[PDB]
Amino acid sequence: MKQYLELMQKVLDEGTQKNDRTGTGTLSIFGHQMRFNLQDGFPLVTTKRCHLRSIIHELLWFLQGDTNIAYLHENNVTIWDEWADENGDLGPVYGKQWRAWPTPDGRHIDQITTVLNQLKNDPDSRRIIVSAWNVGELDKMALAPCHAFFQFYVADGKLSCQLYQRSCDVFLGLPFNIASYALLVHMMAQQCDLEVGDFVWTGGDTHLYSNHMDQTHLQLSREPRPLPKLIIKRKPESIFDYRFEDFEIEGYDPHPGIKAPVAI
Amino acid sequence: MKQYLELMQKVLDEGTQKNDRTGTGTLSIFGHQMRFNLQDGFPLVTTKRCHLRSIIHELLWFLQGDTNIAYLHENNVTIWDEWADENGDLGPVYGKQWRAWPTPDGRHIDQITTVLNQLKNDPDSRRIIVSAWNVGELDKMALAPCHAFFQFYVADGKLSCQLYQRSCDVFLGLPFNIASYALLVHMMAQQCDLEVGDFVWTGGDTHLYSNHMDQTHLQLSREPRPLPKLIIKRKPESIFDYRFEDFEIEGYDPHPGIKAPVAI
């Protein structure tokens, strides 16, 4: 996509070398923002073939409140394998915080239900927030939350969302993160009888791994194709009752896939 | 400042009308970003005189972990009066979360101490975060955190910080928020023997109150002046040991202060 290739080029033009946790090394910038008007089309990268089925299953898994990879394996999705323990557990990562953030007095807060009720009852609220950054549980998580903090907004009958992504693997992770949040906006909008607005993506440490540079430049040589179109075939009774088969992506005509290794 | 006035003009030109919590009404946009290179000067708005005494003492109060306004009153700072209870308490707002975030099991994390140790021991980390958005304590806070989530970053010997500000009163709040985080970067850089980098400001619901239009037109008629310079006159033993008298803002030549009532 235009915005995505422009970000790649910005990291290349303005980034600096950094060592990193994984021992791989990155080229890194700090701070970026871009927007996707979801009425233009569904923002799935076209300059390489992306594995959409994994994106959908990962989001459904988050929405169930799950943090063990068994459900992903049942659906032939392997994207979380490298960080799970011997029983498949990642600890209290995204799904757990989204559905059941633990409070100091023994409560748990379902932030997804909270947001939905805020959008329906008080859409001009400035507090329509989900946070995965539960400071008191970070040490139990297999990785710290990358897509950390997000906010909804309504104007002119349209639902928008902004994500603060504190750490972004531009080549491997970002295509998934953009599509995932776009899908969530569509689902949330359907449940609220709203149209879709913008997905606003904001980055913290926004980086290209040192072993993704040939792949990145191959991708930058390619022209984006038309955005595909997302069709939802049913309105479930709640945001938690979607199924994989409720979604179809039309007109997706990507350039060939480009393989790259993930940094563990 | 140029970027601040561009944002103010953008809210006027593009903002849509909201019926907010306070009943006042706003013009609002969603999703914006600005960048202040702190080596270009200290980013204190010059198109009105900003009350440095209040900005500095509020930050020192946060760093103490204090959420009662008595300390502010001892220093003739009244910016939090309208939301405090009869005992001066605001509940577990910024200072409490920064210094004593409660875990579910009865422990505490001092996020500021953690960040200082990350900057000194793991400056490449992508996890150097402070969150005030403690979902499980929102119901006890007098207002929800505006400056909600922030991140530090180190590259080539320079310390940067990005703030996610989920709700921004462009007229009254934003000049304080920019200066406060810029001052924090200078203090942390001093304690870590780093140079200052960028302050990146990211906004969610970014608004002008409907009773601030005259004041907005006045400020937009004024040209910005060169930025001042921050001088730290004493290097304290830790990030927790600063005092108001340690700071001097040199070369600050603002236009006159503008009087505008806060929306409660």
Ligand SMILES: C#CCN(Cc1ccc2[nH]c(N)nc(=O)c2c1)c1ccc(C(=O)N[C@@H](CCC(=O)O)C(=O)O)cc1
């Ligand atoms: C974000 C996110 C979700 N996740 C979770 C996740 C977990 C740890 C991470 N660690 C690192 N270093 N980068 C990531 O982006 C990252 C992402 C993903 C993990 C891997 C791939 C990936 O390897 N994609 C390959 C193969 C896809 C496939 O299985 O077919 C690709 O070519 O796209 C994508 C997303």
Ligand SMILES: C#CCN(Cc1ccc2[nH]c(N)nc(=O)c2c1)c1ccc(C(=O)N[C@@H](CCC(=O)O)C(=O)O)cc1
């Ligand atoms: C951000 C932040 C901190 N805070 C906390 C705070 C609390 C509630 C809020 N509520 C609303 N509606 N807007 C705010 O920006 C806001 C800010 C501030 C509160 C008031 C002023 C203010 O009235 N400033 C005036 C007068 C300053 C003085 O001389 O006392 C000004 O002219 O600047 C500034 C900051």
Ligand SMILES: *[C@H]1CC(=O)NC(=O)N1[C@H]1C[C@H](O)[C@@H](COP(=O)(O)O)O1
């Ligand atoms: C993390 C998971 C995700 O959804 N998106 C990403 O892009 N993620 C990337 C960011 C880093 O490259 C890595 C996490 O490592 P750190 O915790 O930042 O060291 O995964």
Ligand SMILES: *[C@H]1CC(=O)NC(=O)N1[C@H]1C[C@H](O)[C@@H](COP(=O)(O)O)O1
């Ligand atoms: C809140 C405090 C701060 O530091 N900055 C701000 O700009 N703040 C403004 C934002 C809103 O106008 C108001 C808070 O009200 P909501 O919780 O957003 O309804 O104060």
Ligand code: NA
């Ligand atoms: Na798969």
